[model samples]
Target: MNIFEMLRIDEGLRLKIYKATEGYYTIGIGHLLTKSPSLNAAKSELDKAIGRNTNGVITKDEAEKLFNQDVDAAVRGILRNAKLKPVYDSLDAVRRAALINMVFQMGETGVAGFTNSLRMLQQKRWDEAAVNLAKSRWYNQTPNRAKRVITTFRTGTWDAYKNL
Candidate 1:
Protein backbone atom coordinates (compact mmCIF):
# COMPACT_ATOMS: atom_id res chain seq x y z
CA MET A 1 0.00 0.00 0.00
CA ASN A 2 1.08 3.57 -0.59
CA ILE A 3 2.03 5.68 2.41
CA PHE A 4 -1.04 7.84 1.96
CA GLU A 5 -3.21 4.77 1.90
CA MET A 6 -1.50 3.07 4.83
CA LEU A 7 -1.17 6.03 7.08
CA ARG A 8 -4.24 8.02 7.91
CA ILE A 9 -1.64 10.78 8.17
CA ASP A 10 -3.19 12.96 10.74
CA GLU A 11 -1.05 16.03 11.21
CA GLY A 12 0.55 14.29 14.19
CA LEU A 13 1.64 11.03 12.48
CA ARG A 14 2.94 13.08 9.60
CA LEU A 15 4.90 15.04 12.12
CA LYS A 16 6.20 11.83 13.63
CA ILE A 17 7.42 10.50 10.29
CA TYR A 18 9.00 13.87 9.57
CA LYS A 19 10.50 14.06 13.01
CA ALA A 20 11.92 10.56 12.73
CA THR A 21 13.35 11.11 9.27
CA GLU A 22 14.47 14.71 9.90
CA GLY A 23 15.69 13.98 13.39
CA TYR A 24 14.20 15.38 16.54
CA TYR A 25 15.56 17.27 19.51
CA THR A 26 15.70 14.04 21.48
CA ILE A 27 17.75 12.19 18.88
CA GLY A 28 19.74 15.35 18.15
CA ILE A 29 19.83 14.31 14.51
CA GLY A 30 17.14 13.52 12.02
CA HIS A 31 17.31 10.36 9.95
CA LEU A 32 19.41 12.31 7.46
CA LEU A 33 21.34 13.82 10.36
CA THR A 34 20.41 17.33 9.35
CA LYS A 35 20.50 20.20 11.88
CA SER A 36 17.71 18.71 13.95
CA PRO A 37 14.86 20.23 11.98
CA SER A 38 11.44 20.29 13.63
CA LEU A 39 8.67 17.97 12.51
CA ASN A 40 7.17 20.38 10.02
CA ALA A 41 10.59 21.67 9.08
CA ALA A 42 11.85 18.16 8.65
CA LYS A 43 8.93 17.30 6.43
CA SER A 44 9.62 20.38 4.34
CA GLU A 45 13.27 19.59 4.06
CA LEU A 46 12.58 15.98 3.12
CA ASP A 47 9.93 16.98 0.62
CA LYS A 48 12.12 19.67 -0.92
CA ALA A 49 15.11 17.40 -1.19
CA ILE A 50 13.05 14.55 -2.59
CA GLY A 51 11.28 16.83 -5.04
CA ARG A 52 14.45 18.44 -6.26
CA ASN A 53 16.52 15.29 -6.62
CA THR A 54 13.92 13.09 -8.29
CA ASN A 55 11.77 15.80 -9.84
CA GLY A 56 9.01 14.03 -7.97
CA VAL A 57 9.88 10.69 -9.47
CA ILE A 58 10.24 8.96 -6.06
CA THR A 59 13.48 7.25 -6.99
CA LYS A 60 16.81 6.74 -5.24
CA ASP A 61 17.98 10.25 -6.01
CA GLU A 62 15.12 11.70 -4.02
CA ALA A 63 15.94 9.61 -0.95
CA GLU A 64 19.61 10.25 -1.61
CA LYS A 65 19.28 13.99 -1.17
CA LEU A 66 17.85 13.42 2.25
CA PHE A 67 20.36 10.68 3.08
CA ASN A 68 23.55 9.91 1.16
CA GLN A 69 24.84 7.89 -1.77
CA ASP A 70 25.46 4.70 0.19
CA VAL A 71 22.03 4.73 1.80
CA ASP A 72 20.40 5.60 -1.49
CA ALA A 73 22.21 2.76 -3.18
CA ALA A 74 21.16 0.48 -0.38
CA VAL A 75 17.51 1.36 -0.87
CA ARG A 76 17.73 0.82 -4.59
CA GLY A 77 19.60 -2.38 -3.96
CA ILE A 78 16.84 -3.68 -1.73
CA LEU A 79 14.24 -2.78 -4.30
CA ARG A 80 16.10 -4.76 -6.89
CA ASN A 81 16.81 -7.58 -4.49
CA ALA A 82 13.18 -7.83 -3.57
CA LYS A 83 12.29 -7.84 -7.25
CA LEU A 84 10.73 -4.40 -6.89
CA LYS A 85 7.95 -5.77 -4.75
CA PRO A 86 6.41 -4.03 -1.78
CA VAL A 87 7.79 -5.22 1.55
CA TYR A 88 4.49 -6.51 2.84
CA ASP A 89 2.57 -7.77 -0.16
CA SER A 90 0.04 -9.54 2.01
CA LEU A 91 -0.67 -6.75 4.43
CA ASP A 92 -3.41 -4.22 4.14
CA ALA A 93 -2.33 -0.69 5.18
CA VAL A 94 -0.81 -0.44 8.65
CA ARG A 95 2.02 -2.91 8.12
CA ARG A 96 2.86 -1.28 4.81
CA ALA A 97 3.55 2.15 6.34
CA ALA A 98 5.56 0.52 9.07
CA LEU A 99 7.51 -1.42 6.47
CA ILE A 100 8.22 1.72 4.47
CA ASN A 101 9.18 3.47 7.63
CA MET A 102 11.65 0.70 8.41
CA VAL A 103 13.11 0.74 4.91
CA PHE A 104 13.13 4.51 4.75
CA GLN A 105 15.32 4.61 7.83
CA MET A 106 17.47 1.57 7.08
CA GLY A 107 17.45 2.03 3.28
CA GLU A 108 16.73 -0.81 0.88
CA THR A 109 20.41 -1.13 0.06
CA GLY A 110 21.34 -1.47 3.70
CA VAL A 111 18.67 -4.09 4.09
CA ALA A 112 19.81 -5.82 0.94
CA GLY A 113 23.39 -5.58 2.07
CA PHE A 114 22.63 -8.14 4.73
CA THR A 115 23.43 -11.21 2.73
CA ASN A 116 22.43 -13.66 5.41
CA SER A 117 19.18 -11.86 5.94
CA LEU A 118 18.34 -11.85 2.26
CA ARG A 119 19.31 -15.44 1.88
CA MET A 120 17.23 -16.38 4.83
CA LEU A 121 14.29 -14.53 3.42
CA GLN A 122 14.82 -16.21 0.08
CA GLN A 123 14.90 -19.58 1.79
CA LYS A 124 11.78 -18.71 3.71
CA ARG A 125 13.68 -19.22 6.89
CA TRP A 126 12.10 -16.41 8.87
CA ASP A 127 13.82 -17.40 12.07
CA GLU A 128 17.08 -17.30 10.27
CA ALA A 129 16.08 -14.04 8.74
CA ALA A 130 15.57 -12.57 12.16
CA VAL A 131 18.92 -13.88 13.22
CA ASN A 132 20.48 -12.45 10.09
CA LEU A 133 18.84 -9.14 10.77
CA ALA A 134 20.83 -8.97 13.98
CA LYS A 135 24.01 -9.44 12.00
CA SER A 136 23.99 -6.16 10.11
CA ARG A 137 26.29 -3.15 10.10
CA TRP A 138 23.41 -1.35 11.66
CA TYR A 139 23.08 -3.96 14.37
CA ASN A 140 26.77 -3.68 15.02
CA GLN A 141 26.48 0.04 15.55
CA THR A 142 23.01 0.05 17.05
CA PRO A 143 22.03 -3.31 18.36
CA ASN A 144 18.82 -2.00 19.81
CA ARG A 145 17.68 -0.57 16.54
CA ALA A 146 18.55 -3.68 14.61
CA LYS A 147 16.86 -5.96 17.06
CA ARG A 148 13.77 -3.77 17.04
CA VAL A 149 13.37 -3.76 13.29
CA ILE A 150 14.19 -7.43 13.06
CA THR A 151 11.46 -8.22 15.49
CA THR A 152 9.09 -6.15 13.43
CA PHE A 153 9.90 -7.95 10.21
CA ARG A 154 9.99 -11.37 11.76
CA THR A 155 6.86 -11.05 13.80
CA GLY A 156 4.91 -9.25 11.10
CA THR A 157 4.02 -6.56 13.56
CA TRP A 158 3.89 -2.78 13.15
CA ASP A 159 4.76 -2.06 16.75
CA ALA A 160 8.49 -2.32 16.16
CA TYR A 161 10.73 0.14 14.34
CA LYS A 162 8.20 2.95 14.34
CA ASN A 163 10.43 5.25 16.40
CA LEU A 164 13.58 4.26 14.45
Candidate 2:
Protein backbone atom coordinates (compact mmCIF):
# COMPACT_ATOMS: atom_id res chain seq x y z
CA MET A 1 0.00 0.00 0.00
CA ASN A 2 2.96 2.35 0.73
CA ILE A 3 6.31 3.08 -0.88
CA PHE A 4 8.04 0.74 1.56
CA GLU A 5 5.84 -2.15 0.59
CA MET A 6 6.08 -1.23 -3.08
CA LEU A 7 9.87 -1.18 -2.89
CA ARG A 8 9.90 -4.40 -0.91
CA ILE A 9 7.67 -6.12 -3.44
CA ASP A 10 9.29 -4.69 -6.57
CA GLU A 11 12.75 -3.43 -5.67
CA GLY A 12 13.18 -6.09 -2.97
CA LEU A 13 14.43 -5.39 0.53
CA ARG A 14 17.96 -5.67 1.84
CA LEU A 15 18.21 -5.63 5.64
CA LYS A 16 21.95 -5.12 5.81
CA ILE A 17 24.02 -2.30 4.34
CA TYR A 18 25.40 -3.03 0.91
CA LYS A 19 26.80 -1.07 -1.97
CA ALA A 20 24.12 0.52 -4.16
CA THR A 21 24.15 0.32 -7.92
CA GLU A 22 26.16 3.54 -7.96
CA GLY A 23 28.55 2.09 -5.37
CA TYR A 24 27.46 4.16 -2.38
CA TYR A 25 26.71 2.31 0.87
CA THR A 26 22.99 1.47 0.85
CA ILE A 27 20.48 -0.47 2.91
CA GLY A 28 16.75 -1.00 3.50
CA ILE A 29 15.38 -0.82 -0.03
CA GLY A 30 18.05 1.50 -1.48
CA HIS A 31 18.48 4.27 1.07
CA LEU A 32 21.95 5.59 0.36
CA LEU A 33 23.97 6.18 3.50
CA THR A 34 26.47 8.91 2.88
CA LYS A 35 28.55 11.56 4.64
CA SER A 36 26.14 14.36 3.68
CA PRO A 37 25.05 16.53 6.59
CA SER A 38 21.73 16.98 4.77
CA LEU A 39 20.60 13.57 5.92
CA ASN A 40 18.96 13.24 9.38
CA ALA A 41 20.47 11.65 12.51
CA ALA A 42 19.31 8.17 11.60
CA LYS A 43 20.93 8.30 8.20
CA SER A 44 23.88 10.03 9.82
CA GLU A 45 24.15 7.07 12.15
CA LEU A 46 24.26 4.82 9.14
CA ASP A 47 26.89 7.11 7.64
CA LYS A 48 28.86 6.97 10.88
CA ALA A 49 28.70 3.21 10.97
CA ILE A 50 29.93 3.08 7.40
CA GLY A 51 32.63 5.58 8.36
CA ARG A 52 33.79 3.23 11.09
CA ASN A 53 34.05 0.62 8.33
CA THR A 54 30.96 -1.24 9.44
CA ASN A 55 27.63 -1.83 7.75
CA GLY A 56 24.32 -0.36 8.87
CA VAL A 57 20.92 -2.03 8.99
CA ILE A 58 17.23 -1.04 8.89
CA THR A 59 13.89 -2.56 8.00
CA LYS A 60 12.23 -1.64 4.69
CA ASP A 61 9.39 0.16 6.48
CA GLU A 62 11.80 2.21 8.58
CA ALA A 63 13.67 3.44 5.51
CA GLU A 64 10.41 4.47 3.83
CA LYS A 65 9.16 6.25 6.92
CA LEU A 66 12.52 7.93 7.37
CA PHE A 67 12.51 9.14 3.78
CA ASN A 68 9.04 10.59 4.24
CA GLN A 69 10.07 12.46 7.37
CA ASP A 70 13.18 13.78 5.66
CA VAL A 71 11.05 15.17 2.85
CA ASP A 72 8.57 16.75 5.27
CA ALA A 73 11.34 18.40 7.26
CA ALA A 74 12.83 19.88 4.12
CA VAL A 75 9.50 21.38 3.04
CA ARG A 76 8.86 22.81 6.48
CA GLY A 77 12.44 23.98 7.00
CA ILE A 78 12.45 26.11 3.83
CA LEU A 79 10.14 28.63 5.45
CA ARG A 80 11.02 27.94 9.08
CA ASN A 81 14.75 28.53 8.61
CA ALA A 82 14.59 31.39 6.13
CA LYS A 83 16.78 34.39 6.85
CA LEU A 84 14.04 36.86 6.02
CA LYS A 85 10.56 35.62 6.79
CA PRO A 86 8.62 38.71 5.75
CA VAL A 87 10.30 38.75 2.38
CA TYR A 88 9.81 35.01 1.88
CA ASP A 89 6.15 35.31 2.81
CA SER A 90 5.65 38.12 0.30
CA LEU A 91 6.72 36.08 -2.71
CA ASP A 92 4.29 34.25 -5.03
CA ALA A 93 4.16 30.47 -4.94
CA VAL A 94 6.64 30.13 -7.83
CA ARG A 95 9.10 32.50 -6.21
CA ARG A 96 8.52 30.81 -2.87
CA ALA A 97 9.33 27.47 -4.43
CA ALA A 98 12.50 28.99 -5.88
CA LEU A 99 13.57 30.26 -2.49
CA ILE A 100 12.74 26.91 -0.91
CA ASN A 101 14.90 25.13 -3.47
CA MET A 102 17.66 27.65 -2.82
CA VAL A 103 17.43 26.97 0.89
CA PHE A 104 17.62 23.26 0.22
CA GLN A 105 20.68 23.60 -2.00
CA MET A 106 22.46 25.99 0.36
CA GLY A 107 21.70 25.08 3.95
CA GLU A 108 20.01 27.63 6.25
CA THR A 109 23.41 29.03 7.22
CA GLY A 110 24.59 29.00 3.65
CA VAL A 111 21.41 30.74 2.43
CA ALA A 112 22.00 33.40 5.06
CA GLY A 113 25.18 34.24 3.19
CA PHE A 114 22.94 35.75 0.48
CA THR A 115 22.28 38.89 2.47
CA ASN A 116 22.16 41.14 -0.58
CA SER A 117 19.85 38.77 -2.43
CA LEU A 118 17.54 38.53 0.56
CA ARG A 119 17.56 42.28 0.98
CA MET A 120 16.74 42.75 -2.68
CA LEU A 121 13.87 40.34 -2.40
CA GLN A 122 12.65 42.11 0.76
CA GLN A 123 12.66 45.39 -1.11
CA LYS A 124 10.91 43.82 -4.11
CA ARG A 125 13.86 44.65 -6.31
CA TRP A 126 13.54 41.95 -8.94
CA ASP A 127 16.49 43.02 -11.08
CA GLU A 128 18.71 43.51 -8.09
CA ALA A 129 17.85 40.07 -6.76
CA ALA A 130 18.48 38.45 -10.14
CA VAL A 131 21.81 40.27 -10.44
CA ASN A 132 22.76 39.32 -6.92
CA LEU A 133 21.92 35.68 -7.68
CA ALA A 134 23.92 35.74 -10.94
CA LYS A 135 26.99 37.10 -9.17
CA SER A 136 27.16 34.27 -6.66
CA ARG A 137 29.32 31.14 -6.70
CA TRP A 138 26.05 29.20 -6.72
CA TYR A 139 25.35 30.72 -10.11
CA ASN A 140 28.67 29.51 -11.47
CA GLN A 141 28.34 26.11 -9.89
CA THR A 142 24.80 25.42 -11.05
CA PRO A 143 24.13 27.84 -13.84
CA ASN A 144 20.94 26.30 -15.17
CA ARG A 145 19.24 25.92 -11.83
CA ALA A 146 20.36 29.39 -10.83
CA LYS A 147 18.90 30.76 -14.03
CA ARG A 148 15.59 29.10 -13.26
CA VAL A 149 15.46 30.44 -9.72
CA ILE A 150 16.60 33.89 -10.81
CA THR A 151 13.99 33.93 -13.51
CA THR A 152 11.33 32.91 -11.03
CA PHE A 153 12.49 35.65 -8.68
CA ARG A 154 12.17 38.19 -11.47
CA THR A 155 8.93 36.94 -13.05
CA GLY A 156 7.16 35.04 -10.28
CA THR A 157 6.54 32.15 -12.64
CA TRP A 158 8.01 28.71 -13.40
CA ASP A 159 7.79 29.29 -17.15
CA ALA A 160 11.41 30.27 -17.66
CA TYR A 161 12.82 27.07 -16.25
CA LYS A 162 10.94 24.93 -18.75
CA ASN A 163 12.38 26.66 -21.79
CA LEU A 164 15.87 26.28 -23.33
Candidate 3:
Protein backbone atom coordinates (compact mmCIF):
# COMPACT_ATOMS: atom_id res chain seq x y z
CA MET A 1 0.00 0.00 0.00
CA ASN A 2 0.93 3.68 -0.23
CA ILE A 3 0.68 3.89 3.55
CA PHE A 4 4.37 4.25 4.32
CA GLU A 5 4.37 7.89 3.32
CA MET A 6 1.25 8.59 5.36
CA LEU A 7 2.78 6.91 8.38
CA ARG A 8 5.97 8.95 7.90
CA ILE A 9 4.01 12.16 8.15
CA ASP A 10 2.12 10.83 11.14
CA GLU A 11 5.10 9.40 13.02
CA GLY A 12 7.80 11.74 11.70
CA LEU A 13 11.47 10.90 11.38
CA ARG A 14 13.88 10.74 14.29
CA LEU A 15 17.50 10.04 13.45
CA LYS A 16 18.33 9.82 17.12
CA ILE A 17 16.64 7.01 18.99
CA TYR A 18 14.07 7.84 21.65
CA LYS A 19 11.28 6.36 23.78
CA ALA A 20 7.73 5.69 22.57
CA THR A 21 4.40 6.58 24.25
CA GLU A 22 4.75 3.58 26.57
CA GLY A 23 8.48 4.04 27.33
CA TYR A 24 9.73 1.51 24.79
CA TYR A 25 12.62 2.94 22.81
CA THR A 26 12.02 3.70 19.10
CA ILE A 27 14.37 4.74 16.36
CA GLY A 28 14.20 6.00 12.78
CA ILE A 29 10.56 6.38 11.73
CA GLY A 30 8.68 4.88 14.69
CA HIS A 31 10.48 1.55 14.75
CA LEU A 32 9.44 0.02 18.06
CA LEU A 33 11.55 -2.75 19.52
CA THR A 34 8.56 -4.01 21.48
CA LYS A 35 10.17 -5.36 24.71
CA SER A 36 13.89 -5.27 25.04
CA PRO A 37 16.21 -6.58 27.73
CA SER A 38 18.98 -4.02 27.29
CA LEU A 39 18.62 -0.59 25.78
CA ASN A 40 22.29 -0.41 24.86
CA ALA A 41 22.35 -3.74 23.06
CA ALA A 42 18.91 -3.26 21.60
CA LYS A 43 19.95 0.07 20.11
CA SER A 44 23.11 -1.41 18.71
CA GLU A 45 21.15 -4.16 17.00
CA LEU A 46 18.91 -1.54 15.44
CA ASP A 47 21.94 0.41 14.34
CA LYS A 48 23.03 -2.76 12.61
CA ALA A 49 19.95 -2.45 10.42
CA ILE A 50 21.38 0.84 9.19
CA GLY A 51 24.84 -0.68 8.76
CA ARG A 52 25.95 1.98 11.24
CA ASN A 53 28.04 -0.27 13.45
CA THR A 54 26.21 1.08 16.54
CA ASN A 55 27.76 4.55 16.47
CA GLY A 56 24.50 6.11 17.70
CA VAL A 57 22.18 8.38 15.70
CA ILE A 58 21.44 7.63 11.99
CA THR A 59 21.55 9.06 8.48
CA LYS A 60 18.45 9.77 6.40
CA ASP A 61 19.27 6.93 4.00
CA GLU A 62 19.70 4.60 6.96
CA ALA A 63 16.50 5.86 8.49
CA GLU A 64 14.63 5.32 5.22
CA LYS A 65 15.82 1.73 5.01
CA LEU A 66 14.81 1.08 8.59
CA PHE A 67 11.51 2.78 8.01
CA ASN A 68 10.83 0.60 4.95
CA GLN A 69 11.27 -2.53 7.03
CA ASP A 70 8.70 -1.33 9.54
CA VAL A 71 6.36 -0.37 6.71
CA ASP A 72 6.72 -3.78 5.10
CA ALA A 73 6.01 -5.44 8.40
CA ALA A 74 3.03 -3.18 9.05
CA VAL A 75 1.41 -3.99 5.68
CA ARG A 76 2.08 -7.68 6.15
CA GLY A 77 0.57 -7.57 9.62
CA ILE A 78 -2.74 -6.40 8.16
CA LEU A 79 -2.78 -8.79 5.20
CA ARG A 80 -1.81 -11.73 7.38
CA ASN A 81 -4.74 -11.05 9.67
CA ALA A 82 -7.54 -13.47 8.75
CA LYS A 83 -10.20 -11.20 10.20
CA LEU A 84 -8.94 -8.19 8.28
CA LYS A 85 -8.10 -9.78 4.91
CA PRO A 86 -11.53 -9.80 3.24
CA VAL A 87 -12.49 -6.54 4.86
CA TYR A 88 -9.19 -5.03 3.81
CA ASP A 89 -9.68 -6.24 0.21
CA SER A 90 -13.19 -4.82 -0.05
CA LEU A 91 -12.13 -1.26 0.72
CA ASP A 92 -10.79 1.41 -1.61
CA ALA A 93 -7.12 2.36 -1.46
CA VAL A 94 -7.73 5.31 0.82
CA ARG A 95 -9.84 3.31 3.25
CA ARG A 96 -7.39 0.44 3.05
CA ALA A 97 -4.64 2.88 3.94
CA ALA A 98 -6.63 4.14 6.91
CA LEU A 99 -6.76 0.63 8.31
CA ILE A 100 -3.10 -0.03 7.51
CA ASN A 101 -2.12 3.21 9.18
CA MET A 102 -3.95 2.17 12.33
CA VAL A 103 -2.22 -1.18 12.26
CA PHE A 104 1.04 0.70 11.92
CA GLN A 105 0.15 2.93 14.86
CA MET A 106 -1.15 0.28 17.25
CA GLY A 107 -0.28 -3.14 15.77
CA GLU A 108 -2.65 -5.76 14.38
CA THR A 109 -4.10 -6.83 17.73
CA GLY A 110 -4.91 -3.26 18.70
CA VAL A 111 -6.81 -2.68 15.44
CA ALA A 112 -8.37 -6.14 15.79
CA GLY A 113 -9.85 -5.08 19.13
CA PHE A 114 -12.01 -2.53 17.33
CA THR A 115 -14.72 -5.01 16.52
CA ASN A 116 -17.44 -2.43 16.12
CA SER A 117 -15.31 -0.19 13.95
CA LEU A 118 -14.23 -3.10 11.77
CA ARG A 119 -17.81 -4.23 11.46
CA MET A 120 -18.85 -0.76 10.42
CA LEU A 121 -16.02 -0.64 7.92
CA GLN A 122 -16.96 -4.03 6.52
CA GLN A 123 -20.53 -2.83 6.08
CA LYS A 124 -19.35 0.42 4.42
CA ARG A 125 -20.95 2.34 7.25
CA TRP A 126 -18.52 5.20 6.88
CA ASP A 127 -20.12 7.57 9.35
CA GLU A 128 -20.70 4.83 11.88
CA ALA A 129 -17.12 3.63 11.50
CA ALA A 130 -15.79 7.10 12.13
CA VAL A 131 -18.08 7.40 15.14
CA ASN A 132 -16.86 4.06 16.38
CA LEU A 133 -13.27 5.24 16.08
CA ALA A 134 -13.99 8.27 18.30
CA LYS A 135 -15.26 6.13 21.14
CA SER A 136 -11.81 4.91 22.11
CA ARG A 137 -8.81 5.87 24.18
CA TRP A 138 -6.72 6.02 21.02
CA TYR A 139 -8.76 8.99 19.88
CA ASN A 140 -8.56 10.57 23.33
CA GLN A 141 -4.78 10.14 23.51
CA THR A 142 -4.07 11.51 20.02
CA PRO A 143 -7.02 13.60 19.01
CA ASN A 144 -5.54 15.24 15.95
CA ARG A 145 -4.08 12.06 14.54
CA ALA A 146 -7.25 10.12 15.18
CA LYS A 147 -9.34 12.83 13.56
CA ARG A 148 -7.21 12.77 10.42
CA VAL A 149 -7.34 9.00 10.27
CA ILE A 150 -11.06 8.93 10.89
CA THR A 151 -11.66 11.55 8.21
CA THR A 152 -9.85 9.37 5.71
CA PHE A 153 -11.97 6.41 6.78
CA ARG A 154 -15.18 8.38 6.60
CA THR A 155 -14.51 9.95 3.21
CA GLY A 156 -12.08 7.55 1.59
CA THR A 157 -9.92 10.49 0.63
CA TRP A 158 -6.42 11.71 1.45
CA ASP A 159 -7.47 15.34 1.86
CA ALA A 160 -7.21 15.07 5.64
CA TYR A 161 -3.55 14.09 5.26
CA LYS A 162 -2.23 16.44 2.62
CA ASN A 163 1.17 17.34 4.02
CA LEU A 164 2.44 13.83 3.57
TM-score of every model versus the real structure? 0.45, 0.59, 0.89
Output the TM-score of candidate 2. 0.59
Question: Which candidate has the highest lDDT of all?
Answer: 3
Cα error, residue 74 of model 1, in Å, equals 11
Q: lDDT tens string, model 2, 113-156?
A: 78888889988899988998899888887676677668878987
Give the Cα error of residue 60 in candidate 3, in Å.
0.8
The candidates, ranked best first by lDDT, are 3, 2, 1
Q: How accurate is candidate 2 locally (lDDT)?
A: 0.62
- lDDT tens readout by residue for model 1, 97-150: 444545655556554455655555545576777876765566686566556556
Q: TM-score winner between 1 and 2, please give it.
A: 2
Model with the higher TM-score, candidate 2 or 3: 3
Ranking by TM-score: 3, 2, 1
Worst ten-residue run, lDDT, model 2? 1-10
- Candidate 2: which stretches are off by over 4 Å? 1-68
Which window of 10 residues has the lowest lDDT sum in candidate 3? Answer: 47-56
Estimate, for each residue in 58-129, the C-alpha lDDT of model 3 and write its tens digit: 788888887788778878888899888878988998899898888988999999899988988999999999
lDDT of 2 at 28: 59
Model 3 clash pairs are: none
Backbone clashes per model, in order? Answer: 6, 0, 0
